[PDB]
Amino acid sequence: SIENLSSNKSFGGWHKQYSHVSNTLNCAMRFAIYLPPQASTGAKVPVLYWLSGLTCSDENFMQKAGAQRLAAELGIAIVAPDTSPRGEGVADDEGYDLGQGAGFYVNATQAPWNRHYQMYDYVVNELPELIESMFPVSDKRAIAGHSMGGHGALTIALRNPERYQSVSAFSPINNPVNCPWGQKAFTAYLGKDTDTWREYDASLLMRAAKQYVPALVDQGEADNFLAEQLKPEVLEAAASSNNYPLELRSHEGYDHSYYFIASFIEDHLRFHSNYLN
Ligand SMILES: [Br-]
Structure with a gap:
C-alpha cells in the first residue's frame, strides 16, 4: 500500500519519495518529503505542505527551491504531493494546462475527470492523515504553493x-474564475455552472472569510503571466475589503520561475516557522 522509492541525504536530513495507493484519487500517487535532522532524534517536527504548479511533479520543489538548508536549521518537514493523479489508467489532456500535471486542487465533478481528479480531498484529507501516521510529525501544519499551487x-x-x-504563495492564480487557466480547468473539471467555481477562487474566498489564516504572498514584477493569469491586485482588493491579514510583496526584475522562488523561499520558511511553533 506504500513504497519508499528513493532516499537522498540532504543537509543532514533526508529527502524521501514515496508511492502509495490513494483512496480519494483511486490510483497510485507519488509524494516527496523532506525530513530535517531533528526528525532523526526522536523529536516531532511541524509540517509545511508545498503545492506545486502546472506541469510539476512531486520533485520540482525538492530539487529546485533550495528550501532544505533552512528547513533543516528550523526543524520543519516539507511534504510535496504530486500535482494530479498519474498513469495510463487516469484521464489526461495533451495541453500542459489540463489533466496530468494540472489537477488545480479541485474535486472534479465532470466525466471523465471525476474518476480520479479529487486533488482537493487528497491534499486536505488523505495526505495529512498518511503523513501523520508515517512520520515523526506533530499536528502543526501550514501550506504554501506556486501558481496553480x-x-x-x-x-x-x-x-x-x-x-x-x-499560508503563503509565490505567484498564485488569485482569481481563477477570471483568467484563461482557471476557466479552462474549471469548465473541464467542474462544468459550465460558474456558481460551482466560487469555492475554488482564492480572491472570492478571501472576501468571504470569517476566520483568518495569516498570509504571505510574493510576486515577481517581471512575471509574464502577472496581468492575464495571476492578478495580485485582485487579491489585495479582497484582503482590504475583509480585514484580511495578507502581506503581498512585489519584487522588481523577478519572474515566474524557481529562480524567483529560491531567492525568497527562506522568508517563507521563517514566516511559517513563526506560526507552526
Ligand atoms: Br502554475
Whole structure:
C-alpha cells in the first residue's frame, strides 16, 4: 500500500519519495518529503505542505527551491504531493494546462475527470492523515504553493482555517474564475455552472472569510503571466475589503520561475516557522 522509492541525504536530513495507493484519487500517487535532522532524534517536527504548479511533479520543489538548508536549521518537514493523479489508467489532456500535471486542487465533478481528479480531498484529507501516521510529525501544519499551487494553498487554507497555522504563495492564480487557466480547468473539471467555481477562487474566498489564516504572498514584477493569469491586485482588493491579514510583496526584475522562488523561499520558511511553533 506504500513504497519508499528513493532516499537522498540532504543537509543532514533526508529527502524521501514515496508511492502509495490513494483512496480519494483511486490510483497510485507519488509524494516527496523532506525530513530535517531533528526528525532523526526522536523529536516531532511541524509540517509545511508545498503545492506545486502546472506541469510539476512531486520533485520540482525538492530539487529546485533550495528550501532544505533552512528547513533543516528550523526543524520543519516539507511534504510535496504530486500535482494530479498519474498513469495510463487516469484521464489526461495533451495541453500542459489540463489533466496530468494540472489537477488545480479541485474535486472534479465532470466525466471523465471525476474518476480520479479529487486533488482537493487528497491534499486536505488523505495526505495529512498518511503523513501523520508515517512520520515523526506533530499536528502543526501550514501550506504554501506556486501558481496553480499558490491557488491551491490559498484556497485550501481559506477553506480550512482551523487546520493550517499560516499560508503563503509565490505567484498564485488569485482569481481563477477570471483568467484563461482557471476557466479552462474549471469548465473541464467542474462544468459550465460558474456558481460551482466560487469555492475554488482564492480572491472570492478571501472576501468571504470569517476566520483568518495569516498570509504571505510574493510576486515577481517581471512575471509574464502577472496581468492575464495571476492578478495580485485582485487579491489585495479582497484582503482590504475583509480585514484580511495578507502581506503581498512585489519584487522588481523577478519572474515566474524557481529562480524567483529560491531567492525568497527562506522568508517563507521563517514566516511559517513563526506560526507552526
Ligand atoms: Br502554475
